Symmetry: C2
Subunit: 476 residues, 2 copies
């Protein structure tokens, strides 16, 4: 483990070298907000969700420091942690189960984190890490599909929610307008993205333009709201959130600790004990899975970088997330990846060529005042209308349906054998066999919506794991 | 003249059979729709404009008898003739201008038509028609562009129009939803098209489908609109009405095709004349341009039909339409290729089967009773939103950016050489200069565009004619 550090740590130094180009800069930029909004997005629900329970802030922060700290020891700089709708789900639980068993929220928060963690230490030594291995074609892409799906459904909800409080008949007076916006926005974005995946235009030109898609967009629409509309001329949405903080404490101190334990009733002392765990594993996983897809060798990577480390580190950090009291930062699922597409040559034509690896964007991404300070920043953030982001869910959303290769693999079915692209033979050759495969994939695909119902969807990976690993069984 | 006859009559004979085929089936249907909207489109403005005068029916009939009658003598019948905002515009002139000049709109009308004919007879023999011909690549595409432009604008305008009757300035009172749908549709439509220019499933698969965009859609969406939406529960907005025949001069009165006001000064009779001239020309023009473009020796045909007669004939018809007190079918445009797209075969193939051709669609277009008498059309008329059509304005619109080769030739800036190549050299090669050409061209679009804003705006094709002709140089 230690060893591991030793390998990587020089590279830390290198991140600096790594810094010097254009791409660094967007990379840093687009994402911040990019997270944040989604982040927001769960948040929004989350907070409400907890019948309201001092929520957002936690995140805002959660993410911000987490980005920084995560920077400081450093794990994968090519991966970045923050939040999820699913951590949120845990949280829904977390308050929820606690409420009838009203208790030391504080004890709990702490608690959960701690137990997992301890274990985590140990775990860090464990070659759970095997699990990872498993990759070549089955888990991951799929994995990403789970994610996607949830993302989108939520996105919708968010809109729809946004429609709902207000009315539902003629004038109009509603979310419909809104509805439009988010969408409208969506179309364009897609375009913005598009030469890059399926080309058409001038290399650089395309590059300059396509890369800040996210920023651009948020802005792009947003400015209609900033400088009025042929629409945005009535009640519209943006952000609720506080002008301060709350004590992230239940003690008297100025400045505080790491390891600990506090003074009160017993039962309650024990039984936080599950809940973290399940969380933990999840994280682990998450982190892992994600990492894998990114890390991958289509994504040609074993180029000077960290398989484990980031895990050990992570758990602690997560643990820590529990410690001040603040949300679980989670692996920034596509997001990191997409960066990774960023941090590469494809300019070229579309061609993967040299990695681009570094701490710095990510560190910045973690760190930066933006993903930090927000209270005067509020003006932008507040200026962010809720709708834009809803739209964002969408732009964000189509993306990465751009990588369910399975789909792709599917896709080939529709189109011509006098069409072909790349590794179409993988399938082409096991043509029939392909079809079946999809099903497998599909199995999860139903399986999870349905699952969510019997216990939150969140459980799936486990199952997924359970699944995926066995799936050698096709393969034949 | 005889000669003219001399082709067509032999050919005439064939036609029914020629008509009898399976692409046909698709063809026949879309076209109706294809009419209906513009028919609408103009209608709405116009009618209102004439604070009621040529109602739905006026068009409906106009078209309906026209499709068939025009169908019967036909000098092409591949083609489609119907109404335009510009006729209307003339009509508008006539409405206002007539009002303090007091002879009944209708009474006045009687002379107008006459002139057209006569002059037209003379014309039928003429080769002012000669002029067009000269055209080899430049105008026409532009010509159609003129149409496009308005078309789109209008669409929007309608949209907004819809917003407009009930109060508001730019805030806005809309079916936001209206906006949504139409658009939404539009995006889709685009999809509905897309494999056909630019593939992604099977020849055949497309071949039943992509083509059937219009109809499919119109219908397809409209019922959602009638029942359904992501939710929907708002006042939705459909389409205007009469159970009988409509009024003609400012009226309450219907005078379903009548002419009983024959007894006032000569004088009154006299001044219809301008309106005819320009009109005729216009029509002529319409015919021409469209026809050429359509006829396209490039899109493979100098094969057997006749303009000279038809033109007369048509014109006459229009002249007659006036007894009826009905608007005039003129050559419809965007549809016009598109039929040809029906009657395309490069994409359940890749080249051609020079089409066979059909009376039927066109005839049908006249004929189908709905698209003819209202009283059963009623349902249809009642059922669809203006908005759907607006969406239609749009899908229909995007199309037909598309043989503005020049546009393509624009594209060429954006597109990259190491990708550029199909027939690109006709353009490609005098690359830089190309632009210029185009610049002009667009410039004309513009010049005119700007001009259009000045009324009688209509003069533009002539101008088009000018432009293009003088451009004899350009090319060099």
């Amino acid at each position: 483990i230690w060893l591991d550090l030793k390998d990587r740590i020089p590279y830390y130094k290198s991140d600096w070298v790594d810094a010097f180009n254009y791409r660094v800069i967007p990379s840093t930029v687009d994402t911040y907000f990019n997270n944040l909004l989604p982040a927001i997005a769960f948040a929004q629900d989350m907070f409400d969700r907890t019948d309201n329970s001092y929520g957002v802030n936690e995140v805002l922060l959660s993410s911000a420091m987490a980005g920084i700290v995560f920077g400081v020891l450093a794990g994968q700089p090519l991966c970045i942690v923050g939040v999820t709708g699913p951590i949120s789900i845990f949280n829904y639980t977390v308050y929820e189960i606690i409420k009838p068993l009203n208790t030391s929220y504080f004890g709990f928060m702490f608690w959960i984190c701690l137990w997992s963690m301890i274990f985590h230490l140990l775990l860090a030594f464990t070659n759970v890490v095997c699990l990872l291995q498993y990759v070549t074609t089955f888990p991951c892409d799929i994995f990403g599909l789970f994610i996607n799906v949830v993302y989108i459904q939520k996105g919708i909800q968010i809109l729809t929610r946004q429609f709902h409080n207000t009315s539902g008949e003629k004038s109009v007076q509603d979310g419909f307008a809104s509805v439009v916006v988010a969408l409208v926005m969506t179309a364009f974005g897609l375009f913005f993205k598009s030469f890059h995946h399926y080309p058409l235009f001038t290399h650089k030109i395309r590059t300059f333009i396509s890369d800040y898609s996210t920023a651009l967009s948020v802005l792009f629409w947003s400015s209609f709201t900033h400088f009025g509309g042929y629409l945005n001329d009535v009640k519209f949405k943006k952000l609720p959130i506080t002008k301060s903080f709350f004590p992230t404490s239940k003690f008297n101190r100025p400045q505080n600790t790491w390891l600990a334990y506090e003074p009160i009733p017993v039962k309650d002392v024990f039984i936080a004990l599950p809940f973290g765990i399940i969380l933990t594993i999840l994280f682990y996983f998450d982190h892992n899975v994600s990492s894998l897809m990114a890390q991958r060798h289509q994504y040609k990577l074993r180029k000077p970088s960290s398989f484990h480390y980031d895990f050990a580190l992570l758990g602690l950090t997560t643990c820590i997330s529990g410690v001040l009291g603040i949300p679980a930062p989670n692996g920034l699922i596509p997001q990191a990846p997409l960066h990774t597409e960023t941090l590469l040559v494809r300019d070229s034509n579309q061609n993967v060529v040299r990695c681009v690896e570094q701490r710095l964007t990510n560190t910045f991404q973690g760190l930066m005042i933006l993903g930090t300070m927000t209270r005067p920043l509020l003006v932008c953030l507040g200026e962010i209308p809720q709708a834009v982001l809803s739209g964002l869910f969408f732009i964000m959303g189509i993306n990465g349906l751009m990588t369910n290769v399975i789909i792709h693999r599917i896709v080939f079915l529709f189109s011509d054998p006098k069409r072909r692209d790349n590794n179409s033979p993988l399938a082409k050759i096991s043509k029939r066999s392909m079809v079946i495969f999809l099903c497998f994939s599909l199995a999860g695909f139903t399986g999870e919506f349905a699952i969510t119902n019997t216990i939150a969807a969140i459980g799936f990976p486990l199952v997924l794991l359970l699944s995926v690993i066995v799936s050698f069984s096709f393969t034949y």
